[PDB]
Design a protein around this ligand. Structure first.
Ligand SMILES: CCC1=C(C)/C(=C/C2=NC(=C\c3[nH]c(/C=C4\NC(=O)[C@H](C)[C@H]4CC)c(C)c3CCC(=O)O)/C(CCC(=O)O)=C2C)NC1=O
Ligand SMILES: CCC1=C(C)/C(=C/C2=NC(=C\c3[nH]c(/C=C4\NC(=O)[C@H](C)[C@H]4CC)c(C)c3CCC(=O)O)/C(CCC(=O)O)=C2C)NC1=O
Ligand SMILES: CCC1=C(C)/C(=C/C2=NC(=C\c3[nH]c(/C=C4\NC(=O)[C@H](C)[C@H]4CC)c(C)c3CCC(=O)O)/C(CCC(=O)O)=C2C)NC1=O
Ligand SMILES: CCC1=C(C)/C(=C/C2=NC(=C\c3[nH]c(/C=C4\NC(=O)[C@H](C)[C@H]4CC)c(C)c3CCC(=O)O)/C(CCC(=O)O)=C2C)NC1=O
Ligand SMILES: CCC1=C(C)/C(=C/C2=NC(=C\c3[nH]c(/C=C4\NC(=O)[C@H](C)[C@H]4CC)c(C)c3CCC(=O)O)/C(CCC(=O)O)=C2C)NC1=O
Ligand SMILES: CCC1=C(C)/C(=C/C2=NC(=C\c3[nH]c(/C=C4\NC(=O)[C@H](C)[C@H]4CC)c(C)c3CCC(=O)O)/C(CCC(=O)O)=C2C)NC1=O
Ligand SMILES: CCC1=C(C)/C(=C/C2=NC(=C\c3[nH]c(/C=C4\NC(=O)[C@H](C)[C@H]4CC)c(C)c3CCC(=O)O)/C(CCC(=O)O)=C2C)NC1=O
Ligand SMILES: CCC1=C(C)/C(=C/C2=NC(=C\c3[nH]c(/C=C4\NC(=O)[C@H](C)[C@H]4CC)c(C)c3CCC(=O)O)/C(CCC(=O)O)=C2C)NC1=O
Ligand SMILES: CCC1=C(C)/C(=C/C2=NC(=C\c3[nH]c(/C=C4\NC(=O)[C@H](C)[C@H]4CC)c(C)c3CCC(=O)O)/C(CCC(=O)O)=C2C)NC1=O
Lengths: 195, 160, 58, 162, 162, 160, 160, 162, 160, 162
């Protein structure tokens, strides 16, 4: 009894604090049969990972979805199609500088912040030379993606332990919501009308 | 059903079912006879339920069966009532399964674009679901009606 | 040109995976032409063996 | 996130203590309200679209300039984003009411939301007004006993945003 | 995957028919066996490690060459992959026994397994004998009533490999 | 816990709780008083459970308390029994929670690295938790004993 | 506009605009005076177009203006005419921009959620847009009529 | 991004107005400048490499220490990074000229660029000098009429960095 | 082509062509005869273009045909002129197509590696393309000269 | 990263100078101790598990509150993370000792570590005491001559964290 006594009082650490956690439900598309509701769940989760929120039906890409439920493509190719769409370019490339584009790419497809200045240099050179498509395929054809998600697992948020500064950067990156106006037309203004 | 959801979730983390998941399954199977009795009560009175729900729906919305309406004519009204029969059957299936999964899989995924292709108003469907809820929960006691109302509510919300 | 349909088997050599990992081991997939060189190189460098290559479209 | 039960469990875990009579009292208190919380959650889920309709109509009647040209809710896209946000708030308030705790409101909703709205241009006072409208609409549906419970979580959201 | 309940639901939905006496008897039978199935699943999950150890020991005692040099289970890596496959089979047989259906065995186990083993060089007959050893070891623990049910799905896996 | 698990599952899918999840929670809170009495009973007999479980373990595994064993000596035997006390307290938490979430969050995740860094044998841990299972389920009635045994099975499987 | 689409397409590929894109911009700016003539024509007849389109809408759907309708009363019928004014302004914006981006992003994205929230019937919107199309194209020259009809057709398809 | 037409549409939409005579005047002005803008864009695209050639040449002639040991543009990696930055500046200034608006320079270029260069250690004043050199080179090729308009956007970048 | 680019862009978003894309296709097909006569006049005079362009190129950079140069000798000079003939043919293809995609797939993608494996200096190619631009724009009308010059400019920019 | 050689090279590169007498003296100085560095690195690599076990035991004895309920190392998860972090410190200190340079400790260990531990709630002073315990344990194994060099990098970690 003496060896199990707490020593910091009520001002101690519960298990809920400490390093942040990846979501417990892992979404994947199994090889073979899948019920309709889990398929809708996986598709919705993939859209939520790459576009940071639910995408309405009129914006969802039906051709990749048919390809995926037919088994013609894997989840990795579904994520690649979602990345290479005009909706992604509109939301996460057009309103941002390239250095911010690299950060958003790592967030959306690795569940991560950029690891080092070398990653910034590599992806910046790719973006200056080639644009979104080659940078996206570089992110998706990377060994990190195939070791974390493979072919079937929807990317999720991660808070990697190594290298240094990556955990804090990943916490800030993954906690960040979309800060930019969703459109360039018809801006809103701060102001009142008094009745 | 409940068992399929538990197994799929357990397989997601590549583990066996936890004591909580096994207690979930045990609670579901212990309640099986009750929900079977509820489903049988609903299925024996399906003609009454469908007729009364159609009466209430058409009382609430005469425009549907008035000239220029969606269900105008005997054959279109029969198609309407047959859709109500479909959803009553789906509610019985979801009652025996223990969740809205059969309802969603057979009658909710793609329902909006389907009824759009058919020029069927969605609020009419919601009100028909409410009417069928009322008639069906009339046949059941408070405890049974309470759980059946949840499935009817899921259906109405998914159409809305 | 256009799409290849490639069937490959990628065994595991660095560890033993607790997940089912069968869909990550033997799989058939469609690759674009402009991607197939890199994809074939990745399959080879992972120690995987390419069962078959076909030309679906084109 | 943590519910009420795990809140008690954590309180006793940091102290390395088995459950006291007071711990059992708090657990009984949460178990007693469970059927009430489940009934209220089911009612809210069954009426989410109606609740959003009423609350947004009240907000746009009380602040018309929000939906006039130049306003933050002026476009179809920004109006849809507004009602989407209201659905967020209602659903997460329902989660918190089921849990019996506001931790999920902290981690999932209120975290960085003030700076997000400031960067977006969303008026935060108008959002608190929308949440208050939603509280009023929900309280009539769920009943007084459940209304008092849901008001706590609506107030937590409003205070965190304010 | 597919449950027994989902099985009846599909067989009646493709007919466009409400449940009849036969469907209600099938559902009653599954509901009656549910408690036994849950007991067996709990016992198996509690003893999964012990079952895998006993079954692997029995398999490698009957076929010692499999773990000597030149055997397909000669290396720590291939031995680990072997016991891992046995754990796969036990866990999925438990899933399917709980479900009262062999759908999950087709969809998530046997789909492309024979060809994968053929390409890898895995002896299918010896894997089948390991599955059989799991059958006897599991039947020893779960009891007479659950042993036949669990061996149904073990035999399904054995035949799907055969 | 049960409510936390249902809410997290619904939040991942960005939906409200289904009738099935609400029914699971209702059946959970309906059975709160009996599981709470079980936790009461285990808390009352904590000292007896630790005493008898330690005695059973050290009779079945004398190598642990012999020289060269990890628990040799009064101090290391007391640390052993204190770990047993930790796990019994986690089991009471899991009983009131309705799932093994407290047990997994405090005493399972990372246990292998911890006990490897302590030179503590894992078969010794499983023998100790099975001893505690026997002692604790001896006190309770049959259904409550089975419920507690499920949690001790989860723990033994996590260690083994 | 057309220029913006060409620029974003070039930028996503990290390149300068190709001769085809520059030719497209050249053709767009060489048609600017005609587009401004058409947009100014539609601006002059704003009130004529809106009042005629409202008349055509309200004769075809009296129940909308009748008691219990969505537009019943001076305030709600004024809101209806105000929405028609919104969309005619959007059509002029699309005419000058040479494409339907202003229309899609001010009045199409989220329009279904808007009008579900407002309980406005979408077929009413569609055939009100067809009424504006007929009235507006009755005023323009045949060449201009086809061009304006393209934007009205796009908007009508977008509402459905 | 906004171009000139988008800017006019915005200024009239945020106040609920149809286009006026002033709006149509701005639109006519942009359509009149369109042919000159397209010609300049084609010329610059044909000669982007040469513009970077001469601009970097004269920037490193005025500031030799940049490319000499100890300078920020001294290594092949850092020199290549510098010419890549000049490529960015030319391409985006051409985008902004073709649009008739500076919004793309705000969103895609200048947003956070001083932060980036401060963290990198890049001398911002010398970057402004490189942009001025690029202006001088480009104005020769595009001709005076296009030189004025293109120098507008070169000066926008120079003022945003300085 | 312009048509292929428009269709591919619409297909990527899974939509029909917008009024802007249809306007682009209209403007392209309305100028087909002009592009056709331009390609005709380039084809019928290709020998003159190639001869004069080779003369100008070797005058501006004699080091290529000086000893030790890449084009030294009648055989290598003939290969040089054959490459210029290739690029004139691709320019005609690009003129009829309305875009620079035939040039891109046939003679730009991989040109860097090809000419490095040939040891051909890219500045020499760029100057040869300028020589072809001058010679070809010499014998066409001003607007036709501008139209061909845009494609020649793209080819020079791609070669550098 | 940098080592002694790479440090000297970068020093002479930023001046654009060829190697001088003092440079070759420093290079000889590193080459002379390379053998001792390899020997010590192999010693730590062999005994890393023992070092971490003994250092963690010493630290948790000196500060028992770290692992009592409510401590920052109280859970199997947080205890594992603590001993894992100590293993990281030992491994990177061995890298630094082998490289003859503390640059890797800055760039790959110490940069952003205080901020990380502050956001986590990990007590930095206790982490420093753990590093000191690691120093004490490692010094006995490596031997005094290697122990001084190893203690250079251990104290570098402690000072950077302090
Ligand atoms: C190579 C450089 C490097 C270091 C050192 C590093 C440390 C580090 N420790 C972490 C968590 C942690 N670190 C500790 C460390 C212990 N807390 C106790 O009080 C002790 C005083 C102390 C060690 C002696 C603990 C308890 C956690 C929380 C673990 C959890 O919540 O599960 C985390 C958050 C991410 C994760 O746990 O996976 C990092 C990044 N990361 C790095 O990239
Ligand atoms: C753009 C190129 C493209 C095509 C052409 C295409 C067709 C297509 N239809 C499919 C399924 C289907 N297709 C149909 C349509 C049939 N039902 C019958 O009654 C009708 C006679 C007939 C249609 C006129 C149906 C019912 C399914 C679902 C089958 C199932 O879910 O098992 C599938 C399998 C996956 C899915 O559900 O989407 C494909 C790939 N997909 C594409 O990406
Ligand atoms: C559950 C956690 C969560 C929250 C809370 C959340 C809010 C949120 N609302 C947003 C947009 C928005 N939100 C609003 C709502 C405002 N408009 C009116 O003025 C009202 C006063 C008020 C609502 C009652 C509007 C108009 C936008 C559009 C902003 C824009 O596109 O310019 C955005 C920007 C990106 C997006 O479109 O989703 C976020 C992140 N997102 C989350 O993941
Ligand atoms: C070359 C790669 C390789 C290795 C290393 C390997 C080890 C190995 N040792 C085994 C048996 C065994 N190995 C041991 C060794 C232990 N006895 C004491 O505890 C010691 C701590 C320790 C030895 C120093 C024992 C006791 C058995 C018999 C266990 C049994 O069959 O019940 C077995 C089971 C099959 C058999 O009996 O041969 C394997 C697979 N197998 C391989 O393919
Ligand atoms: C969840 C369903 C599932 C199954 C069943 C499955 C089987 C499977 N076994 C594999 C390897 C293996 N499997 C075995 C086991 C066999 N060889 C021994 O001789 C025994 C006779 C027998 C087991 C009783 C061995 C030895 C390997 C290693 C093959 C190698 O890499 O050389 C692999 C390749 C990936 C890896 O090495 O981890 C798969 C995919 N995968 C799955 O996802
Ligand atoms: C620029 C993009 C944009 C649009 C289009 C838009 C429409 C819009 N229409 C509204 C109300 C309304 N809109 C209508 C129009 C409908 N009534 C009939 O059914 C017709 C079929 C149909 C019009 C043709 C009516 C009747 C109302 C009043 C609803 C009420 O007060 O209850 C409202 C709520 C605030 C208000 O009363 O002004 C909006 C925001 N808002 C925007 O920011
Ligand atoms: C430490 C790594 C590094 C290198 C290598 C480097 C090379 C370098 N050489 C340059 C100029 C030059 N370099 C050369 C050398 C060429 N002349 C012939 O063509 C030969 C084939 C070839 C040499 C064998 C010439 C002629 C120039 C003058 C270019 C001009 O004035 O236009 C310049 C431009 C600035 C200046 O004039 O100093 C650089 C940056 N810079 C660096 O930071
Ligand atoms: C599209 C808008 C955009 C810009 C402009 C941009 C600039 C940018 N410049 C960078 C580096 C650099 N930039 C320069 C350029 C400077 N060095 C000399 O002093 C010159 C005065 C001056 C150029 C005229 C240099 C030398 C580096 C390398 C810095 C380093 O590695 O330490 C980097 C880091 C990645 C890399 O090394 O390639 C970025 C992101 N990023 C963007 O997203
Ligand atoms: C609730 C989560 C949790 C657990 C479980 C936990 C266990 C734990 N047991 C420890 C020591 C110990 N643990 C044991 C237990 C072993 N003795 C026999 O071998 C048995 C097989 C086995 C127990 C049944 C012993 C003997 C020690 C003393 C180690 C020593 O003195 O070197 C320590 C080192 C610090 C200390 O003694 O206070 C921890 C942290 N810590 C946690 O935060």
């Amino acid at each position: 009894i003496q060896k199990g006594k707490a020593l910091r009082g009520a001002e101690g650490d519960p298990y809920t604090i400490g390093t942040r956690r990846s979501p417990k439900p892992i979404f994947w598309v199994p090889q073979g049969g899948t019920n309709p509701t889990e398929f809708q769940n996986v598709i919705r989760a993939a859209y939520r990972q790459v576009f940071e929120r639910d995408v309405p039906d009129y914006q969802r890409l039906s051709y990749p979805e048919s390809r995926l439920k037919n088994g013609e493509i894997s989840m990795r190719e579904f994520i690649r199609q979602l990345a290479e769409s005009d909706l992604y370019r509109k939301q996460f490339y057009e309103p941002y500088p390239n250095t911010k584009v690299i950060e958003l790419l790592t967030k959306h497809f690795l569940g991560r912040a950029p690891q080092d200045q070398a990653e910034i240099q590599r992806y910046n050179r790719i973006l200056a030379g080639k644009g979104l498509k080659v940078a996206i395929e570089e992110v998706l054809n990377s060994d990190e993606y195939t070791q974390l998600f493979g072919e079937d697992v929807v990317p999720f948020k991660r808070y990697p332990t190594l290298p240094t500064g990556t955990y804090l950067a990943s916490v800030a990156t993954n906690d960040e919501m979309i800060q930019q106006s969703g459109s360039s037309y018809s801006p809103s203004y701060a102001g009142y009308s008094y009745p | 059903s409940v068992v399929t959801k538990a197994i799929v979730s357990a397989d997601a983390e590549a583990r066996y079912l936890s004591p909580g998941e096994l207690d979930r399954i045990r609670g579901f199977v212990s309640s099986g006879e009750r929900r079977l009795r509820v489903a049988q009560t609903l299925t024996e009175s399906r003609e009454r339920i469908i007729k009364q729900a159609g009466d209430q729906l058409f009382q609430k919305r005469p425009d549907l069966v008035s000239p220029g309406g969606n269900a105008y004519g005997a054959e279109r009204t029969a198609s309407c009532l047959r859709d109500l029969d479909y959803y009553l059957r789906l509610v019985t299936f979801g009652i025996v399964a223990g969740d809205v999964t059969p309802i969603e899989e057979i009658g909710v995924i793609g329902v909006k674009e389907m009824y759009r292709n058919l020029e069927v108003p969605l609020p009419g469907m919601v009100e028909a679901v409410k009417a069928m809820k009322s008639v069906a929960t009339g046949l059941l006691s408070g405890d049974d009606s309470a759980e059946v109302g949840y499935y009817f509510d899921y259906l109405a919300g998914a159409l809305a | 040109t256009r799409l290849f349909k490639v069937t490959a088997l990628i065994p595991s050599y660095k560890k033993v995976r607790g997940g089912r990992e069968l869909q990550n081991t033997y799989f058939t997939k469609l690759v674009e032409y402009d991607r197939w060189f890199a994809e074939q190189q990745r399959i080879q460098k992972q120690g995987g063996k390419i069962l078959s290559v076909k030309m679906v479209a084109g | 996130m943590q519910d009420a039960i795990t809140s008690v469990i954590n309180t006793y875990d940091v102290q390395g203590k088995y459950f006291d009579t007071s711990a059992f009292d708090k657990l009984k208190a949460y178990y007693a309200t469970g059927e009430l919380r489940v009934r209220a959650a089911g009612t809210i889920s069954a009426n989410a679209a109606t609740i959003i309709k009423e609350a947004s109509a009240k907000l746009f009647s009380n602040q018309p300039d929000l939906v006039r040209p130049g306003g933050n809710a002026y476009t179809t896209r920004r109006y849809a984003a507004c009602v989407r946000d209201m659905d967020y708030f209602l659903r997460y308030a329902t989660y918190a009411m089921l849990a019996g705790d506001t931790s999920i409101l902290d981690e999932r909703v209120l975290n960085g939301l003030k700076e997000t709205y400031n960067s977006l241009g969303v008026p935060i006072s108008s959002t608190v007004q929308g949440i208050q409208a939603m509280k009023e609409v929900t309280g009539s549906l769920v009943g007084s006993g459940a209304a008092k419970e849901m008001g706590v979580y609506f107030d937590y959201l409003s205070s965190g945003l304010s």
